[model samples]
Target: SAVQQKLAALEKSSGGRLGVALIDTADNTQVLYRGDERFPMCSTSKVMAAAAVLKQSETQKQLLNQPVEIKPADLVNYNPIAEKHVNGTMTLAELSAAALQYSDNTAMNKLIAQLGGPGGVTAFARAIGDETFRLDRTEPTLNTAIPGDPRDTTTPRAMAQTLRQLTLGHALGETQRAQLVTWLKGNTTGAASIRAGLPTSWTVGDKTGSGDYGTTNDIAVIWPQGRAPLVLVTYFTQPQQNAESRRDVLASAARIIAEG
Candidate 1:
């Protein structure tokens, strides 16, 4: 559709490398622009961590009830919530909430470890049919988006597809799926990215990420009035030396698809 052409132009004019994929569930139509290019999967990997944890909990019903302690060593930057409760303990379910709802670094590392580490998450991504997603490291390390290094990366197309599978498809049982969606919908940090592009009548469940090399991203399932749901993923990156990403680029990408 014409949206694809505009998105291509947007990618070029936006000054940074931009990748976008939009899937309209009404007809399984996809509009792509550099959708297959890899981008650093910073905090965005929290979504994968949460999904893997929930998927595992299906067979191990007690997993959700398991207690997760916030050790001193688990502390890392950007863990505002975890900082207040270093010695306190939270259930695995609570850790999942902390990671998704607050993007807590400490909580995310715990979730990643709960699945047995990055390889565990890699397996979960593959299980969900996401061939282009990979998690090679944990939080702060994963956030180091080395230019041209493909570790800890996912293409826009794959991220959107995986999110759809977990949230709207059969990758997760209904109970866990609802929990994942609920957590994403309650995210406190996506206000300036995808959500800012949406109309008040529309609703969005999304995850946002920021990393080194100017990487900024948002993957969302948008529910618009009078249409089926839309899964949209946008990733932006720039030279490694230039660390700050232009988030308006992400917002504008969503706006085009939303308005279209």
Candidate 2:
């Protein structure tokens, strides 16, 4: 497929390993490149955590309304909203917004605590039958980039597949799914990645993740009018660059796939 070929070209220019999954659920078509390999998930794991909370709330409706406290010890460097809320509390709903929309580290750490501990996300994945996704640590620590290590990582296929389940499959309740979509669509951190690849007319909602080793990634549900949505995950890891010097890799792949 020309889409796959062009996507491969982008990988070389990226100077890193690119894990891609482009799934057109409407026709049951897909393009998976290095899709099974692991890539640091960074804050993107927040989506899975959000999904888990939503899914769990289906039976345990109290989870979303619980006011989880944010103490100074829970704060992390990247937490914008959580900083102001230290010694205060936020509902699971508010924390999710900060986690997904703002990518707030403290917000996620608090949210993960709701599930159980740092391993809660991993348990959620297994309960949902997603073996390829793993989260062993929580914020800040999970952001560590060990080239060959697999902790706190997810495969492109796993990310896209789980997203499809949440967005388009039967994994979530109708109202719950809609709320989740609202948060994702409201994401404030996707500018340099997936959002940058797209044109104005297309409406997209995504979770973006960044870490050391130039690990920048985006998992998105993209839909223009009159089409079934497309789920795309672009997970990039470039040890050679040290820092994220290649934001265009994921965006370029998005453009190529969008054009296709």
Candidate 3:
């Protein structure tokens, strides 16, 4: 009754493609509404990319204050942003924050490179047990301007599981996890979706992403009543659709998942 009620409500309320997943972190139960494919992570993929940097920092694979110089050519593609910050200097810490806080593509690309390049992130994701997890940014066929391309890929279950590991103090060491949580907390841009539906009194730390067409995704750690935590990752892709409308649809679904 509950599931059907929510589904019907969503069907009528949605303005576009909707995908939502809810998780009880303590017990690890999952409930879904049209969530399946990995899709584009958009800025959200930066979450894992940030994770890669944080983990690398903890292991001395990288340093937070380690300074790096940006070149003009590095600024040209992927983002108009880094293209603007040309020849600027920043540490790994700043780059990580830029990637997570502001969704700076240049910062993300730099951090991705610092953490041993794209291959590094792929390896870290897999080491944590995400057999299907991928760093396919360079794969031309899988690439899309949209953030959560189905070709780029991850599953709702896997997304939730990754966040659980983060919450449970098992994914990365304490220092690394703390850094990740701090970075996630500082994420201010993508707040309109997953957290927008929650009660103001609650604390929701999450990373949101949207791709070129209409790919939208979110991975979150939400604090709910008497629950370990609510972790969810969802993706929706419709190249012809508008990203904002997709956000509204997903936001509505997230509201139902959180409030229902």
Candidate 4:
């Protein structure tokens, strides 16, 4: 298939491990490239956290729009949201937007705590049918691990499954689903991944993940004009590949899917 062959060439050229999965949400046509390989998810885990909170909102507790205080200690190092506020208050919905749109570590830390830590996030993922995905620790700690000691992990296939379920309104109610999709559409991070190769007319709702040991991932629902939306999951791990190289690989993968 053109999809696999093109992505395989891109992986070879970049000298990295690449995992990819693409599915047409309408007709369910699909393609896979190393889709089963596990890779560190980094900030991408925030999506699962957001989804978990939304699910909880249905029965246990309402997380969004509830006021919460953020202390300086909760702020992880180098987070934009933390830098702007030493100690302040923001609603859960606001924090969710910051975490998803800007990859705010501090906001993510708070959300993790609110959801009952890593175990809670893991439980939600399992309930949603993701067997291999794991959220073992909060951000900053999870981001600092050495190569091969990933605390948050998922395969491209699992990521696609999660996104697919979300798109189908599996765990979240209508309002929560809309909110999650809105945050993803407003994501201001990762301009170089799947979004880079997409046509200007297409709309992308996605999340990006990066790590200490050369990991880059982008999972997206892309809407092309006159066609049904599709999901694309790209994960790459290359200790030697720089950000640009990894992004190039992602863009190449995106181009393949776009062309298909």
Candidate lDDT scores, in order, read: 0.87, 0.86, 0.68, 0.82
* lDDT (Cα, tens digit) per residue for candidate 1, span 108-213: 8898888888899899988878888889988789988887889999888888888889888989999999999899889888999988888978888888889888
Name the Cα RMSD for model 3.
3.2
Q: Which candidate order results from sorting by lDDT in descending order?
A: 1, 2, 4, 3
Write the residue-wise lDDT of candidate 2 on 46-126 in tens digits. Answer: 999888889888998787898888888877788899888888888899989999999998888887888898678788888
Maximum-lDDT candidate: 1
What RMSD does each model have against the real structure?
Answer: 1.3, 1.3, 3.2, 1.9
Candidate 2: segments with Cα more than 4 A from true spot: none
For residue 247, model 3's alpha carbon misses the true position, in angstroms, by 1.6
Is 2 or 4 the stronger prediction by TM-score?
A: 2
- Model 2 has a clash total of 0
lDDT of 4 at 11: 85
| Backbone clashes counted, model 3 | 13
Clashes of 1: 0
| Per-residue lDDT of candidate 3, residues 1-260 (tens digit) | 59647855775654344555677766667887655655555666677777877777766855888887888766634554455556777888877777777777778878777767677877888888877666766422233645444445666666777777865557888877877778787777656777777776667777877665666667778776655667766566564645443665556667777665
Ten residues in a row with the worst lDDT in model 4?
239-248
lDDT of 4 by residue, 1-260 (tens): 86678888888888778889888888887788888877888888899988888888887566577988877777776578756666678888888888899999888887888888899989999998889899998878775425566468888888897897886546678888888888899899868889998898999998998876577788898878998889899988876534433677788889888887
Checking candidate 4 for backbone clashes, the offending pairs are none
TM-scores, in order shown?
0.96, 0.96, 0.85, 0.93
Error of 1 at 138 (Å): 0.9
